[PDB]
Design a binder for this molecule. Structure first.
Ligand SMILES: C[S@@+](CC[C@H](N)C(=O)[O-])C[C@H]1O[C@@H](n2cnc3c(N)ncnc32)[C@H](O)[C@@H]1O
Length: 209
């Protein structure tokens, strides 16, 4: 909570304790950030995962962060304000991406407005599906997708959809997540980059019953 990771992150200049979650996931799952010349960070504010990517990615990497709340600028990182569930976000990201494909798409989204446990879990699951849809549109073949996901009655359905689009799909809970009961992280590796993509594979009405 206000624990060891909170204060280490402060002292190192990271904007949030959650910096350690992606550092630890990256260290266990093959240092994908060090291999990523283009990174999209979804639901990024205040921006500590963007800071991690800025530190670990090759120099001259393209790092793009998006959140509903404004983020303070970071050197050599692009940030903008949008709702990742919207066409607005879909269009702004495409302008920054130009002809590039992303090596890695990160997602650490969670609802801001509390609506009770059941609906907060569903909002988070909807966020995760939208983040996945953006990753499917932007990832290079064999790219990586890392997402926070809440434990809920829709977790299994999201995992299944992930397994249709990635060679390897693994749940993880790094040390900096140990005492955060709601959350698991899913590392998706080897984006299949299908020529034929099913609209239903990413349709919320089909995924969520
Ligand atoms: C857990 S924080 C992300 C922390 C970030 N990984 C870091 O290290 O600084 C979750 C963020 O998701 C954002 N969020 C929730 N729903 C969103 C949406 N629909 N579109 C964009 N951002 C959203 C919230 O504004 C919040 O900033």
């Amino acid at each position: 909570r206000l624990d060891r990771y909170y204060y280490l992150a402060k002292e190192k200049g990271y904007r949030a304790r959650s910096s350690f979650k992606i550092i630890q996931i990256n260290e266990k799952y093959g240092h994908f950030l060090e291999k990523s010349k283009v990174v999209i960070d979804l639901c990024a504010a205040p921006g500590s995962w963007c800071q991690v990517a800025s530190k670990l990615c090759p120099v001259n990497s393209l790092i793009i962060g998006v959140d509903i709340v404004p983020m303070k600028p970071m050197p050599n990182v692009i940030t903008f304000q949008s709702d990742i569930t919207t066409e607005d976000c879909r269009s702004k990201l495409r302008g920054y991406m130009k002809t590039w494909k992303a090596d890695t798409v990160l997602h650490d989204g969670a609802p801001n407005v509390g609506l009770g446990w059941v609906q907060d879990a569903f909002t988070q699951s909807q966020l995760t599906l939208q983040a996945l849809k953006l990753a499917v549109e932007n990832l290079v073949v064999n790219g990586t997708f890392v997402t926070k996901i809440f434990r809920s009655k829709d977790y299994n359905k999201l995992i299944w959809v992930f397994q249709q689009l990635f060679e390897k799909v693994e749940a993880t809970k790094p040390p900096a997540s140990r005492n955060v009961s709601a959350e698991i992280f899913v590392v998706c590796k080897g984006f299949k980059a299908p020529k034929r993509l099913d609209p239903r594979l990413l349709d919320p009405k089909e995924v969520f019953e």
